[PDB]
Amino acid sequence: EELRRRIEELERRIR
Amino acid sequence: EELRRRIEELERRIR
């Protein structure tokens, strides 16, 4: 969950 | 693999 949520937040901003 | 591939796709776009 920890790293998944951080990836998900980056994806909203970039993709 | 799941999270690795998503990081790899973000890296292509940013770095």
Place this chain on the structure above:
Amino acid sequence: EELRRRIEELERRIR
């Protein structure tokens, strides 16, 4: 650590 550090480097650039 591997994937964490890569996420951390992306976060510095985006957020």
